[PDB]
Amino acid sequence: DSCIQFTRHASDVLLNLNRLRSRDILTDVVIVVSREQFRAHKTVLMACSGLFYSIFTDQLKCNLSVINLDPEINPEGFCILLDFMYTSRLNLREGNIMAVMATAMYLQMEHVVDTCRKFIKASE
Amino acid sequence: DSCIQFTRHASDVLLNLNRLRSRDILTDVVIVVSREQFRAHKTVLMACSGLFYSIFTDQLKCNLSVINLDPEINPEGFCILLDFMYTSRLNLREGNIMAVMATAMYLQMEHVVDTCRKFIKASE
């Protein structure tokens, strides 16, 4: 086509989606990770994760307001990945890298799994 | 913080939100523009437009499944702007620029209004 493109548009959209999440506006699901609860938008979770994409395209699970993750999932690892979904920024540290990588593998977030693998390989 | 950032994340999220829109997945509103209907995600509309942000933060309108726009709004101008919201690409042409600018002013999409003003000024 002959379209013009606004370079900062995608980043501005994601910034506003994170502002809606912070104010709990139009969040339509609670993700339960052991004792911890995380409110989010189903569409953003699907757009970032192969696991959530599979869950919310399922004809019965698409209507659930609560999703319980596997008990082996670490709430801090999930929190870090949820923040990444809404910001593009990943808080990867020596103390959390193993939990973040395991959570990203479970959530099917291949770019996160890739950077975790590279950061671990460098420390070996 | 000491975060790492994935450059293509925001663009990848927006691409997936557009794929969900194209397959009519988890769309929660229909925007009526005279005889034409457009399905969308309330969160994306709010993230792109000052008008939709005001509408869906309203305690009564947040729950409506149908929103009717002002009869002066051109359906093609709306379609072009809805496509821009989901892609960052604006199909701006001599034949549609006046309708696109008027629709962007109504929707409160200041970056679109700005480029329309500059493109019109250049043709004068």
Partner: peptide
């Protein structure tokens, strides 16, 4: 704005 750019030419993509």
């Amino acid at each position: 704005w750019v030419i993509p």
